[PDB]
Design a binder for this molecule. Structure first.
Ligand SMILES: Cc1cc(/C=C/C#N)cc(C)c1Nc1ccnc(Nc2ccc(C#N)cc2)n1
Lengths: 412, 554
């Protein structure tokens, strides 16, 4: 019934982010949603004396026909004073990534039951634009904790903490982690009961006071990881050996003990690229030693909670994508490979948008935060289309790569 | 007395850390003071302003300007200082409707609402900051002090507060009368509909009745304004629109400014006049920045202008949007990185047209440019119509498929169809994915001395063919490209090329079909002539034979 006061970071004013173009379908969806939110007292119309703004759009979660409002609070979040909670900081649960099954639940609705500090409401202003700007954009601000805002989970924490005590005390082995509007629940249970605990959990939440029916299943135990592998052949051409030395030279930046001298020797002389070269024993042994080195973990690799996570993605063709997550170059914390057919047999950009959400989800589970993406696409193309395929309630940061990395094939 | 609903005031504040203005009133002539006193006396009688005590410490300078040499005077309160200290407001004026997005209307009535403006009270607590002083005759008595009770003309928040206040009043009328559209511009309301005129006039009377609930009266005359309207540079007619007359001046000599003016007119014209071109005229403005500096017109530009005068020969109109039909966007390549387009619903009846120029960059290709044009049109279309048009593009479905499946970046173009109208966009070459059996293998390399700028480029092949050419005024990067060029020049129709240049590979893998570097262009011309080319990369200084760096190490 009371609100915890909130303020912006020193020397920072509220967000003033332009609302990007919305399709007619998304505008109608938002008008309908906000009209009901206004009636329920969650948002209120605002006057011209509020110059702030945050973009809004609409999405459809994984297999749901009902539109969901999604506010892009990325700017507000970086400007809102760090809301370290009474938790002293809930240490990210390292056991979540090790569970057999993890279901993701959207509990964002709970937030709307808690009032937002009156003096901070102005900074949550947003606009529902009109097609061709024919009529004034509809302006609103939040009266309650909004979904997608950094401070919502922080402020609702204490309430969530006691809302789950029962379930948690009766199920001390189940791991429950919260990130923004999602709740991650993991357990080694047989998928059949795992689901019972989940549906039980929400029925235990719905009864406790609050579309929570949806579920997203992940399998950390069956997750993608990749070692560096060299070809195994009976006959090597000059070209095969040139490609191998190139890959080994690249790998030597990750693994110090890698050697190519003996293999390079085979390449001395101006030979036809398709000519078959028999491997000497010295070159064969060198290749063997390198294979061994490549079976050992990378040296000096560690995660630092105060550093940003970086994610790079490469289009490998035929619907396959590779990616690496690291904080320091050549010190990969996670690498993977995707090849997926949710709807984009023929759409590069949908595929990349889905790869980005999958990687972010993995990142949240493992480290409790989102990475900064380096995307292989032109900025104009990405910004024109990503919102058409987005299905997550959070949004990571991203930048663009315009020069073809030479290291594409070495990762596939 | 019939009670009327008050107009809610908007709470205004000064920027944080700032106080009100304290600007000295300027000395005026006895003549101007009597005028200002008279002027302020009625304003005061009208409720606009009120006399204030000596307490108020704020001030803003008031002036008196004669009216085009009339018998009348007019007061001007200069709020520049108060404006710098007043908070920022939400300005809903940004991004005006584009005529091609409007719907045709049978009738459009105009209503003057300038009087309603003065029923909008200024926030009581902000009034004090609007204080001003009419000096006294001969400075022998205290000047007369006043503060505003209504939105002051010239004040920063007046436009936004007036508009938002009017919108709030109009809201329920618009919502309960979906068959009409209402738009406010300046002191007028424009009301349009497709109603049988009787019903349309009834709607107008109902609006006047609605406004009276706030005691806002309207002229009860026939506003001077009637279709067509001159608005934001356009002419709006009941069922068509166009830009206001575009007149290209006749000139024997042009200056930077004249050309910037010309390009401004051509750009404005390009939204409905198809084909307009501005590249040859725009490039003349490459870092001139001297308004007066007269620039000679290249014959290339003199040609572009003549072509534009032709296009502007006669009036061209666009039609309005019909929500019930599909939107089609057709694009054509014009050359020199220029692209043109038309958006229509029915053949030969454009809603609007436009153009796209390639982005600045070292290397490019037609397929990438086409893609950027498509993305630009898509976004503009979402803004104007809220949907993506179906595209008609001069590129074969097979060419597009080869391109995107092989390009290293993710790329996409929405629903489209091939339209066979030259010049068509094509892929000019395609490198091999595997080494060519039977084709000679050229190992190339180049190097340059950073100090002397002298270098060498060359190759050695499996057949014993060899070449090294001495070069001057060069760099490592240019010698690396020269080496590849020599190999292409001296090989047959199929060739394998081995290089250690990450730079050269970075360029070729980007698949340019045109470049700002003549060297890269020469290489592109050779690739186009070959039948098969495999380009292999190897690490430098790793003892890979053929890697004949030694030949170019001197
Ligand atoms: C933007 C706008 C400018 C003016 C005018 C401002 C001025 N001056 C008048 C109106 C009524 C509107 N609003 C809308 C909204 C939807 N369709 C239309 N179509 C439409 C408008 C004018 C004419 C005409 N003649 C024909 C069709 N107008």
């Amino acid at each position: 019934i009371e609100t915890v006061p909130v303020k912006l970071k020193p020397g920072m004013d509220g967000p003033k982010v332009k609302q990007w173009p919305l399709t007619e379908e998304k505008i109608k969806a938002l008008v309908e949603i906000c009209t009901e939110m206004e009636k329920e007292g969650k948002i209120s119309k605002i006057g011209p004396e509020n110059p702030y703004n945050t973009p809004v759009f609409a999405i459809k979660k994984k297999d749901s026909t009902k539109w969901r409002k999604l506010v892009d609070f990325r700017e507000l979040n970086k400007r809102t004073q760090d809301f370290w909670e009474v938790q002293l900081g809930i240490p990210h649960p390292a056991g979540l990534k090790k569970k057999k099954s993890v279901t993701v639940l959207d509990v964002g609705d709970a937030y709307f039951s808690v009032p937002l500090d009156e003096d901070f409401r102005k900074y949550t202003a947003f606009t529902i634009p009109s097609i061709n700007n024919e009529t004034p954009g509809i302006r609103y601000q939040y009266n309650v904790l909004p979904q997608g805002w950094k401070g919502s989970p922080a402020i609702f924490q204490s309430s969530m903490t006691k809302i789950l005590e029962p379930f948690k005390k009766q199920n001390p082995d189940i791991v429950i982690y919260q990130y923004m509007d999602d709740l991650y629940v993991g357990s080694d249970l047989e998928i059949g009961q795992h689901r019972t605990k989940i549906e039980e959990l929400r029925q235990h939440l719905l009864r406790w006071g609050l579309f929570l029916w949806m579920g997203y299943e992940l399998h950390p135990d069956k997750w993608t990881v990749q070692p560096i592998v060299l070809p195994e052949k009976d006959s090597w051409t000059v070209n095969d050996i040139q490609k191998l030395v190139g890959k080994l030279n690249w790998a030597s930046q990750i693994y110090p003990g890698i050697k190519v001298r003996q293999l390079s020797k085979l390449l001395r002389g101006t030979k036809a690229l398709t000519e078959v070269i028999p491997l000497t024993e010295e070159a064969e042994l060198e290749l063997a030693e390198n294979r061994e080195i490549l079976k050992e973990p990378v040296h000096g690799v560690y995660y630092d909670p105060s550093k940003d996570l970086i994610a790079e993605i490469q289009k490998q063709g035929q619907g396959q994508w590779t990616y690496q997550i690291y904080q320091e170059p050549f010190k990969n914390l996670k690498t993977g490979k995707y090849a997926r057919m949710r709807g984009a047999h023929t759409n590069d950009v949908k595929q990349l948008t889905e790869a980005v959400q999958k990687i972010t989800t993995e990142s949240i589970v493992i480290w409790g935060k989102t990475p900064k993406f380096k995307l292989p696409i032109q900025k104009e193309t990405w910004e024109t289309w990503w919102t058409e395929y987005w299905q997550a309630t959070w949004i990571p940061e991203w930048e663009f790569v315009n020069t073809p990395p030479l290291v594409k094939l070495w990762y596939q | 007395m019939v009670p009327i609903s008050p107009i809610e005031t908007v709470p205004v504040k000064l920027k944080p850390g700032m106080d009100g203005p304290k600007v000295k009133q300027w000395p005026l002539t006895e003549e101007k003071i009597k005028a200002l006193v008279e002027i302020c006396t009625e304003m005061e009688k009208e409720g606009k302003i009120s006399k204030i005590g000596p307490e108020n410490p704020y001030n803003t300078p008031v002036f008196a300007i004669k009216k085009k040499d009339s018998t009348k005077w007019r007061k001007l309160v200069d709020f520049r200082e108060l404006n710098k200290r007043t908070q920022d407001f939400w300005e809903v004026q940004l991004g005006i409707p584009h005529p091609a997005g409007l719907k045709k209307k049978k009738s459009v009535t105009v209503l003057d609402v300038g009087d309603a403006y003065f029923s909008v009270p200024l926030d009581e607590d902000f009034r004090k900051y609007t204080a001003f002083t009419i000096p006294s005759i001969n400075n022998e008595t205290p000047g007369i002090r006043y503060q505003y009770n209504v939105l002051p003309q010239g004040w920063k928040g007046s436009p936004a507060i007036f508009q938002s206040s009017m919108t709030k009043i109009l809201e329920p009328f618009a919502a309960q009368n979906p068959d009409i559209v209402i738009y406010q511009y300046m002191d007028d309301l424009y009301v349009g509909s497709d109603l049988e005129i009787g019903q349309h006039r009834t709607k107008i009377e109902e609006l006047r009745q609605h406004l009276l609930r706030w005691g806002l009266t309207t002229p009860d005359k026939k506003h001077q304004k009637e279709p067509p309207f001159l608005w934001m540079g356009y002419e709006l007619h009941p069922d068509k629109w166009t830009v206001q007359p575009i007149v290209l001046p006749e000139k024997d000599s042009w200056t930077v400014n004249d050309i910037q003016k010309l390009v401004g007119k051509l750009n404005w014209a390009s939204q409905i006049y198809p084909g307009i071109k501005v590249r040859q005229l725009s490039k003349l403005l490459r870092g001139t920045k001297a308004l007066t500096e007269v620039i000679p017109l290249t014959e290339e530009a003199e040609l572009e202008l003549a072509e534009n005068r032709e296009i502007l020969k006669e009036p061209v109109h666009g039609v309005y949007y019909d929500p019930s039909k599909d939107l089609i966007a057709e694009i054509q390549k014009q050359g020199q990185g220029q692209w043109t387009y038309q958006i229509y619903q029915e053949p030969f009846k454009n809603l609007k047209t436009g153009k796209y120029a390639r982005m600045r960059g070292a290397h490019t290709n037609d397929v990438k440019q086409l893609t950027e044009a498509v993305q630009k049109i898509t976004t503009e279309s979402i803004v104007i119509w809220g949907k993506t048009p179906k595209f008609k593009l001069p590129i074969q479905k097979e060419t597009w498929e080869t391109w995107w499946t092989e390009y290293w970046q993710a790329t996409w173009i929405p629903e489209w169809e091939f339209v066979n109208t030259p010049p068509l966009v094509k892929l000019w070459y395609q490198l091999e994915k595997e080494p060519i059996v039977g084709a000679e293998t050229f190992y190339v390399d180049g190097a340059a001395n950073r100090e002397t700028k002298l270098g060498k480029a060359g190759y050695v092949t499996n057949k014993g063919r060899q070449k090294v050419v001495p070069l001057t005024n060069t760099t490592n990067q240019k010698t690396e490209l020269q080496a590849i060029y020599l190999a292409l020049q001296d090989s047959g129709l199929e060739v394998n090329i081995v290089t250690d240049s990450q730079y050269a590979l970075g360029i070729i893998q980007a698949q340019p079909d045109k470049s700002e570097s003549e060297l890269v262009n020469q290489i592109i011309e050779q690739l186009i002539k070959k039948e098969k080319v495999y380009l292999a990369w190897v690490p430098a200084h790793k003892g890979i034979g053929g890697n004949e760096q030694v030949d170019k190490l001197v």
